[PDB]
Structure 1
Amino acid sequence: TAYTPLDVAQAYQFPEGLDGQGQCIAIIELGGGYDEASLAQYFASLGVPAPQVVSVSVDGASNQPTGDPSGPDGHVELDIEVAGALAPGAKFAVYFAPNTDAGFLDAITTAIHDPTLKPSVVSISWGGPEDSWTSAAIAAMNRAFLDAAALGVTVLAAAGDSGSTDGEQDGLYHVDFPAASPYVLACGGTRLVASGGRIAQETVWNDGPDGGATGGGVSRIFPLPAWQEHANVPPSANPGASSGRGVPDLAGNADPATGYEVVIDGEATVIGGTSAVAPLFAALVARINQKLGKAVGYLNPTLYQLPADVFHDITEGNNDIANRAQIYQAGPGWDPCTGLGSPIGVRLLQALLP
C-alpha cells in the first residue's frame, strides 16, 4: 500500500481550515538538493497550492541536487513534499550544511536564530546514535535546542530507521541524537492501516534487519526529564540499567510497505521512514500555531500532561531488528517504540486552545 501526505493527515485527523499561513517552517538538510519547479508540480498533482520555498547556504553548502533519488535528494524532497503538502500556506526555509557535526550544528543554530525567515518550527531528519557525538557537539547542540525553546521554536527530530540498535552494530541498544535530546520532539515510526479517515491498524514499524525499523529506547546520556516520570519509562536495556530520556515522544506512519507516494528527482515512487514523520508533525504544529495566533514552541512537558485520548495509542510490535529479544516493545500508553503514539489533530489542537 501507500498514501499521499493528505491521506495520512486525514488518518491523523489534522484540523481543517489551517494551511500554516503566517508560519515559517525550517528544514535541515545535510547535502543533496531540491528542484523548485519540480516541487511545484508535485503539489499541483496533489491539488495543493505550491508553498513558497527558500534555500539558505550554510558553511559554504547549498541546494545541489545530484539526481540520485537514493542519495540525499530523496531525503531533501521527501522532507519538503511531506510538510509542504500539509502546511502549504506556510513559508519553507531549507538550510543546507556539510554532512558533519559542525555543519549540522551551524545549520540548526542558523535556522533557529534566523532574523529574517524566522521559523517557528524546526524539522530535522538527520542524526546519529548519541554515543558517537563529541561532547562539544552534544553540548552546543543542546545549547541550541535550549535556545529554540526560549525563542518559542518547536524542534522535531526523526528518531531513526534502524530499530533499537540504531545501526550501531556492537551488540548494545542505542538511541539517536538529536532525537534523544529532551528539548526535542522525537518522532518514531509505525505501520498505518487506515481508510476513510478511520484508523484500522497502527503498529510499530519493523520490517526487519533489512526493511528498517523505528528508532526508540532510553538515552543513557540524558536523564529522565521530570515530565516523563509518569510515562513509565524503563531503564535502558543495556547492562547497567540506567535511568534516561525515553525516546520517542510521538510516532507516525513510516513503514515503506504503507509508504508515501512521492516524486523524487522526476520519478514516481513510494517511500517511508521516520524522516517523513518529523516534517509531517511539523505541518501539524504550524497549523496549530496558525489557529492560536501564537507559536507553541516547546511541547514536550505539555504533551505528557494532556489527556491520553489526545493520542492514538500504539500497543503492538517492537523495534528490535537485532535479535528476538523484542527490545523495545510497544504497550499501553508511552512505550519506547512509538512514544505517546500518533497525535489526533483536532484533539491536540482543542487541548491547546486557551
Structure 2
Amino acid sequence: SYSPEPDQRRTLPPGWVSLGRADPEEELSLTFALRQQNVERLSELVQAVSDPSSPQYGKYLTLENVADLVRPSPLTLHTVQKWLLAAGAQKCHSVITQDFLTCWLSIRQAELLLPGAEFHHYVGGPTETHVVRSPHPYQLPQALAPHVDFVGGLHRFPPTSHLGVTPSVIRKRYNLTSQDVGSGTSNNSQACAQFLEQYFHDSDLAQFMRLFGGNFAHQASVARVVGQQGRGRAGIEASLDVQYLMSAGANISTWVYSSPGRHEGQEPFLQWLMLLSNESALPHVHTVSYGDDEDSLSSAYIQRVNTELMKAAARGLTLLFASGDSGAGCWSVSGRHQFRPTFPASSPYVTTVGGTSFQEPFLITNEIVDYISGGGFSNVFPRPSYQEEAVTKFLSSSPHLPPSSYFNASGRAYPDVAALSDGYWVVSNRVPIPWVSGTSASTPVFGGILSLINEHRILSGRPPLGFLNPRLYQQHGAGLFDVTRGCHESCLDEEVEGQGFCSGPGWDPVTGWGTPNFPALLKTLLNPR
C-alpha cells in the first residue's frame, strides 16, 4: 500500500493530556480530500483574473465555475465511495466542489480502512477540546492513491493558545475620517475566522462599541455566525478579531466564523476551508488567524491547502493571514539553528499581515517594527514572480542581512503588509482588557480598511480587489506607510543573537510594504488601473 503523509509531524503538542488508546466501538469524523482535476489550469486562471495588466482581471469565477473546473473525475467519486461504503462509512456529506468528503466511522472501522492508523484520544487547551488522533502513520491501499490526497483528522491538532491602542487611535493613525465608513446598503460584507475554543459574544461587542465607537457609525452586531454550538466563555482572541474588524471597516455587514468542526474530532481550519466551498455567496474579505510551523506539515496537506486558497482567489475573495508572533522563528535541525517560517502565511496566494509598533513611548506619530512580527522565507513555495522585484532589491541592499545559513532566499517571502500589533484594548466577558498584542490584531485592522475600499469599488462600477498581492506589488506598495526601523525576533544564540531580518526602505520581510494610509491607499487602489 501507500503512505501519503510520511512527512506529517505526528508528535503531541504541549497542553494536550493523553488519554489512552481509543475505544474500538468509539466513533470518529474523518474528512477525505479527494483528487481534484485541473489544478494547473486553476493556477493560470487565478493569475489571469488577479493580474491587473490582464484583460480578464476582475472577471471572477462563480463557485459553480470553480466546481465545473476542479471536481474529481467520475472514477474518483465512484472508487472513493463504495470503498467507503464498505468499511461502513456512515451518513456523509460532500460540498459543491465535491472535492471533499466527511464521514462517520468507528475507529476499528477507520483503523482497518486506513492501515497503520492507531487512534488515541486527547484533551487540551486552557479550555478543553476533545480529539481522536493517531501518533503512528497511516496508509491508503495502493488502489486509491490517485484518488485521495490525504485524510483529515489523523495527526494535526487544533490550536491551543507606548500608548494603548483604541479604535480612535487606529482611525487617527491610518487617517480614517469620521465619515470613512460603510454605507451599509450594498451587499458588501466582511468576515473573520478564528479557531480556538472561544466564543465571541454579542454583548461584549455592544459593550466594546459603547466605549469606543462614539465617533463613527457602526453596525450594532454581527450579521451572521457560522459554527456555533452552545453557551460559552469568551476569550480575548475571539473578541479582538471581531471588535477591530468592525472598527476598521466600520458600518459594514460582518460574518464571524467560529472554529468550525472543532467540537468534534476535526481539523478546524480544514473544516472552514471545506465550508468556503459549500456556499456560493460569500463576504469579499476574510481575516484569518491561523498558523503552523511550515516544516511540520505534510507536502500533500500543504499543497492541497494552497490549492483551496487558489480557489478563493479565483472567486475574487481577499484572504488575509496573520504573519505570526515569533518573529523569524527558531528551528533546530540536524545540529543547527534556522529561522522557522509559518503556514498558511507562507502561501503565495494570500495577503500576509505583519506587526507594527509605536516608535516613541508617548506619541503615535510614527510606526516602527513590532519585535514579534512574524516574517521570512518559505522552504516549500518558490518566490512568486509578483515579488521578484521587491525581494531581490531587499536581498541586494540590506545591511543587516542574516547569515544565509538561516534561510532560503529562493522562497516566497513575507509578510506582504503590516499594521499595529501592540497594546490593544479588547472587551471580553464584559470586562475590558488592556494590553493585547499580536499580528491577530493587525490582520483584522488591515482587513477592514480593505473591505471599506471594496465598497468604493463596487458602489462604483468595479469588481472587488480579490487576491490583492499582484496589484499591491505592481504598484510598489503605494499607499502604505513604509516601515523602515527595527528588526523582529529570532534565536537566542551566538550567530543570530535574538535577531531575525530587519526592516528597511522598500518592502521587507518584517512588515512587507508597511502600513495602511487609508487616503493614499484609496487613491491607488481606485485608480482605474
**TM-score, normalising length: structure 1:** 0.86
Using a 3 Å threshold, how does the CA distance of structure 1 residues 107 and 199 change in structure 2: closer, same or farther?
A: same
* Alpha-carbon distance between aligned partners in 1 of 2:230 and 2:322, rounded to the nearest angstrom: 21
> 1:317 maps to what in 2?
486
* Alpha-carbon spacing, 1:320–1:266, altered in 2? closer, same or farther (3 Å): same
Matched, 1:344 2:517: yes
Cα distance per residue 1:234-277 (max 9 Å; x no partner):
4994457440111100011112xxx1111122221121210011
Moved over 6 A (4+): none
Which of 23, 29, 53 aligns to 2:223? It is 53
Q: 2:182 aligns with which of 8, 16, 19?
A: 19
Give the Cα–Cα distance (whole angstroms) in 2 for the partners of residues 2 and 37 of structure 1.
22
Deviation at 1:33, TM superposition (A): 0.6
Q: Against the structure 1 CA distance between its residues 3 and 243, is the aligned structure 2 distance closer, same or farther, given a 3 Å change threshold?
A: same
What is the count of residue pairs matched by the alignment?
334
The answer on 1:216 being equivalent to 2:385 is no
Q: Quote the residue 2:500 is aligned against.
A: 327
Kindly name which structure, 1 or 2, has the bigger radius of gyration based on alpha carbons.
2
Secondary structure (helix, strand or coil) at the match of 2:433 reads strand
Instruction: Measure, in 2, the Cα distance between the counterparts of 1:20 and 1:228.
Output: 35
Give the alignment partner of residue 120 of structure 1, picking from 261, 268, 284. Answer: 284
- Map 1:20-99; keep pairs closer than 5 Å: 21=184, 22-30=187-195, 31-46=197-212, 47=214, 48-57=218-227, 62=229, 65-67=232-234, 73-95=235-257, 96-98=259-261
Change (3 A) 1:265 1:337: same
In the alignment, which residue of structure 1 is the partner of 2:352?
A: 186
Q: Deviations over 1:84-114 (max 9, x none)?
A: 1222322222222256983202213414653
Contact 2:357–2:370 (CA under 8 A) maintained in structure 1 = yes
For residue 290 of structure 1, give the secondary structure of its aligned residue in structure 2: helix
Q: Look up the SS of the partner of 1:230 in the other structure.
A: helix
Aligned-residue Cα RMSD (Å) equals 2.6
Tell me which amino acid in the other structure corresponds to 2:318: T
The equivalent residue for 1:250 is 417
Q: Note closer, same or farther for the CA distance 1:55–1:291 as it changes in structure 2 (3 Å cut).
A: same
Give the AA of the match of 1:54: R
- Counterpart residue identity of residue 271, structure 2: D
C-alpha separation between the residues in 1 aligned to 2:491 and 2:288?
25
Q: In 2, distance between residues paired with 1:125 and 1:43?
A: 22
Query: In the alignment, is residue 288 of structure 1 matched against residue 450 of structure 2?
Result: no
- The Cα shift of 1:233 comes to 4.7
1:55 aligned counterpart, secondary structure = strand
Which residue, out of 429, 432, 443, partners 1:268? 432
Confirm or deny that 1:176 pairs with 2:342: yes
Q: Is the 8 A contact 1:55 1:62 kept in 2?
A: no
Letter in 2 for 1:230: E
Residues 1:140 and 2:304 are matched in the alignment = yes
Q: Quickly say closer, same or farther: Cα 1:199–1:172, change in 2 above 3 A.
A: same
What is the identity, as a one-letter code, of the residue corresponding to 1:335? D
Gaps of 5+ in 2: 1-162, 396-401
Tell me how far apart the structure 2 counterparts of residues 301 and 109 of structure 1 sit (CA, whole Å). Answer: 26
- In 1, the alpha carbon distance for the partners of 2:487 and 2:413 equals 15
Instruction: Spell out, residue by residue over 1:26-78, the C-alpha distance to the aligned partner (whole angstroms, 9 max, x if none).
Output: 22121211111221221122224424332212xxx6475334xxxxx211110
> Does structure 2 retain, via aligned residues, the 8 Å contact 1:236–1:244?
no
Amino acid at match of 1:286: S
The equivalent of 2:268 in structure 1 is 103
1:297 & 1:149 partners in 2: Cα distance? Answer: 6
Structure 1 stretch displaced more, 331-340 or 137-146? 137-146
Q: CA deviation at 1:169?
A: 6.1
In 2, the alpha carbon distance for the partners of 1:128 and 1:281 equals 21
How far apart, in 2, do the equivalents of 1:325 and 1:88 lie?
38
Confirm or deny that 1:277 pairs with 2:419: no
Q: Which amino acid aligns with 1:141?
A: V
Distance 1:194 1:349 in 2: 28
Of 164, 167, 170, 1:2 maps to 164
Residue 254 of structure 1 aligns with an amino acid whose one-letter code is S
In 1, Cα distance between equivalents of 2:277 and 2:172: 30
**Contact 1:236 1:242 (8 Å CA) reproduced:** no
Contact 1:120 1:154 in 2 (8 A): yes
SS at 2:304's partner residue?
helix
Q: For residue 174 of structure 1, what is the amino acid of its counterpart?
A: R
Distance in 2 separating the partners of 1:237 and 1:218: 11
State the distance in 2 between where 1:240 and 1:286 align. 34
Rounded to whole Å, the distance in 1 between the matches of 2:503 and 2:431 is: 35
SS of structure 2 residue aligned to 1:190: strand
Distance 1:55 1:183, change over 3 A: same
Structure 1 gaps of 5+ residues are 68-72, 207-212
Find the partner of 2:326 among 145, 153, 162: 162
Shift in CA distance, 138/241, structure 1 to aligned 2, threshold 3 Å? closer
Q: CA, structure 1 residues 306+113, in 2 after alignment: closer, same or farther (shift >3 Å)?
A: farther
The alpha carbon displacement at 1:17 in A equals: 3.2
| C-alpha spacing 1:36/1:74, structure 2 compared with 1 (3 Å) | same
Q: What letter matches 2:468 in structure 1?
A: L
Measured after TM superposition, the shift of residue 158 of structure 1 is 0.2
Q: Is the 8 A contact 2:202 2:222 kept in 1?
A: no
Q: Percent identity?
A: 32
The amino acid that maps onto 2:443 is A
Letter of the 1:97 partner, please give it.
Answer: P
Q: Specify which of 302, 316, 323 is matched with residue 152 of structure 1.
A: 316
Is the Cα–Cα contact under 8 Å of residues 506 and 513 in structure 2 kept in the other structure?
Answer: yes
Question: What residue is the counterpart of 2:469 in the other structure?
Answer: 300
